[PDB]
Amino acid sequence: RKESYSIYVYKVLKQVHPDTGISSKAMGIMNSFVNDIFERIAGEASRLAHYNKRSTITSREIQTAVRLLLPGELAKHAVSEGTKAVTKYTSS
């Protein structure tokens, strides 16, 4: 009973490698991966909010969580991707 993201990992896979499939065992790994990362980020955003006596998790808590949790370039790119998405969404 963990969340499935299979449809979404399929779409992403088609954008990156239109050529290539993924076995269901591999999809099971990818699902564990997305759940794990969601939980780490959300957990850290929750702590940040509590530390700062904030009632609300916003994109700022997610951004800081991302910076804390992800190493090096992965974090820089993740932060750029998050920021872009919020910019697009806000415009659109």
């Binding site: 099971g28 699902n31 564990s32 794990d36």
Partner: protein, 84 residues
Amino acid sequence: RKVLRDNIQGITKPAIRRLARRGGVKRISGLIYEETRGVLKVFLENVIRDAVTYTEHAKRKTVTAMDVVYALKRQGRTLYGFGG
């Protein structure tokens, strides 16, 4: 409901050797087999105890894969592939 015993002996010399090989090990002393059994038993006992704790908390009698995944998380190990 037979009483299981001595099943640690089912972790045989060739199995342990294969594991050491995957671990890049070239040569193995004869005393490693019994050591490895003792190490594995401790690891398993710990994980199974926690798994069963989650199972009993939920008032189930069947240990599930998610009970195991939670148990492992509790030891600082994150296992992927069993969330379905």
